[PDB]
Amino acid sequence: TDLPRLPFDNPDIMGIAPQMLALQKEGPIARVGTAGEDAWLVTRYDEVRTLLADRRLRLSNPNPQPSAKSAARAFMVALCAGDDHETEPARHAQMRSLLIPRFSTRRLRLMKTRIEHHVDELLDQLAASAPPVDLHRVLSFRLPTMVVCDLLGVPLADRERFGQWARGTFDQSDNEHSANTFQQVVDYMLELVARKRVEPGDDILSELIAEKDGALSDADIAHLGNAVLLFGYETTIVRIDLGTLLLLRNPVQRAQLAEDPGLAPAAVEEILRLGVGGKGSNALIPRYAHGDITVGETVIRTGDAVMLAIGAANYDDRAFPDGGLFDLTRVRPRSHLAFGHGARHCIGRTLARIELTAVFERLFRRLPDLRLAVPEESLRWQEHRITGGFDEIPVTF
């Protein structure tokens, strides 16, 4: 008997930690230690998907004496309207009601066109530079920040101002830096709201200002803009990096995609399913039980913490034959869990898919000899950030 402790070591730079796969082989649910409270860890696809759809399991903490959290985690939960268990139902319902129509088919069609042209231009710059080049800085970082500038209706140079604010806000290692960064996000968004009130455009805050005949306060609208800014680019950057690394590891699939860019949607779904970095602490969706829930032969009690391992579930052989293999020829693959499921299903997931498809339609056709210029083992996943990620991806081509 040895209680497992999150996070688990991963000897590889990607994939699932061996001890989490070991727990998965034993059963769907295990009690584990963490850096804070003990929690139930759920690692199999069926059970993770069932529990993400169970409304007894919520982001908000119902406990009378809640455990302490990093400033990074507190900001994240607040931005998700989960900081008060008594008001989370109405506040989270309103959050989703106000954000979902900001990603209409009209907006996504226009943005798809601009995204495709932007990747062409980014790759043209990449192709003309002398290697070695940091693919993360010149491609992975630039497309999603471009997209967020578009959603917010601000000049593209603004991304040089806000480009590290998701990383700083979600720095679990430095509470002072987290709060100082979040204050900069807040000041920026409040400036942005005040400008949009006299100079609206075709963008998200303008639409929120017009909403319900202007019934929302500037703080309400800035709060929603902060969620788009801090959730809307950093995780996409990370997926472009992991997708590139994954395709570099599988030359046969890479060659298939270069030959037929019609495989890019299939490649994108495989990248999302398998794209897990380092110790993979960001591939856990945290919850608290607001009522008792049975999972197999285990009772989750009201108040317990639960870690739903979407990364481990996406590797589950029970749901994906040869779950550890990158295969863009899978016939009717199950829907992966990388955008979550149920009440808090990723609001940006169709836009994120459009970005990832535009990149991987083009990347290896435009740069056929692209490859890492450093060993994989030199690539360092940033464990202290909620959103993880690599800081650089040196390439040659």
Tell me the one-letter amino acid at 253: Q
**Residue of the chain from 163, 168, 311, 348 that contacts ligand HEM (CB under 6 A):** 348
The answer to whether residues 243 and 350 touch, using CB atoms and an 8 Å cutoff, is no
- Residue 265 structure tokens: 């949607």
Can residue 344 be called a binding residue for ligand HEM (CB under 6 A)?
Answer: yes
C-alpha to C-alpha distance for 194 and 331, rounded to whole angstroms: 50
Residues that bind ligand 7PF (CB under 6 A): 231, 235, 282, 285-286, 386-388
Is there a binding annotation on residue 80? no
Closest CA to 352 of 242, 252, 255: 242
**HSE of 289 in the Cβ direction (CA atoms, 13 Å)?**
17
Whole-number minimum distance, CB 239 to ligand HEM, in Å? 4
Closest CA to 269 of 253, 282, 284, 252: 253
Can residue 387 be called a binding residue for ligand HEM (CB under 6 A)?
Answer: no
Q: Say whether the peptide bond before residue 132 is cis (omega within 30 degrees of 0).
A: yes
Contacts of 32 (CB under 8 A, 6+ apart): 3, 4, 5, 6, 23, 38, 39, 40, 41, 307
Nearer to ligand 7PF among residue 243 and residue 362 (C-beta):
243
According to DSSP, residue 137 is labeled I
Give the nearest residue (CB) to ligand HEM. 348
Nearer to ligand 7PF among residue 24 and residue 387 (C-beta):
387
The binder of 386, among ligand 7PF, ligand HEM, none, by C-beta within 5 to 8 A per type, is ligand 7PF
- Residue 199 structure tokens: 């100079």
Can residue 24 be called a binding residue for ligand HEM (CB under 6 A)?
Answer: no
The answer to whether residues 329 and 336 touch, using CB atoms and an 8 Å cutoff, is no
- Residue 277 structure tokens: 């970095």
The binder of 22, among ligand 7PF, ligand HEM, none, by C-beta within 5 to 8 A per type, is none
Contact window for ligand HEM (CB under 6 A) among 34-42, 155-163, 178-186, 336-344: 336-344
**Residue of the chain from 39, 59, 166, 319 that contacts ligand HEM (CB under 6 A):** 59
Can residue 166 be called a binding residue for ligand HEM (CB under 6 A)?
Answer: no
Whole-number minimum distance, CB 375 to ligand 7PF, in Å? 25
The binder of 74, among ligand HEM, ligand 7PF, none, by C-beta within 5 to 8 A per type, is none
Nearer to ligand HEM among residue 110 and residue 127 (C-beta):
110
User: Dihedral through CA 185, CA 188, CA 192, CA 193, nearest 10?
Assistant: 60
Helix residue ranges per DSSP H, the chain: 18-26, 45-52, 71-79, 88-99, 105-128, 135, 142-152, 159-162, 165-169, 175-198, 204-210, 218-231, 234-249, 251-259, 264-274, 310-314, 349-366
Can residue 228 be called a binding residue for ligand HEM (CB under 6 A)?
Answer: yes
- Residue 270 structure tokens: 């495989």
Nearer to ligand 7PF among residue 239 and residue 362 (C-beta):
239
Q: What is the largest CA-CA distance in the chain?
A: 64
Nearer to ligand HEM among residue 242 and residue 328 (C-beta):
242
The binder of 6, among ligand 7PF, ligand HEM, none, by C-beta within 5 to 8 A per type, is none
**Residue of the chain from 34, 60, 226, 236 that contacts ligand HEM (CB under 6 A):** 236
- Residue 316 structure tokens: 């589950």
Whole-number minimum distance, CB 284 to ligand 7PF, in Å? 6
Bridging pattern class, strands 305-309 and 39-42: parallel
Whole-number minimum distance, CB 228 to ligand HEM, in Å? 5
**Residue of the chain from 61, 235, 250, 314 that contacts ligand HEM (CB under 6 A):** 235
Annotated binding site for heme: 346
Annotated binding site: 346
Note the residues at the interface with ligand HEM (CB under 6 A).
Answer: 59, 80, 96, 99, 227-228, 231-232, 235-236, 239, 285, 338-340, 344, 346-348, 351-352
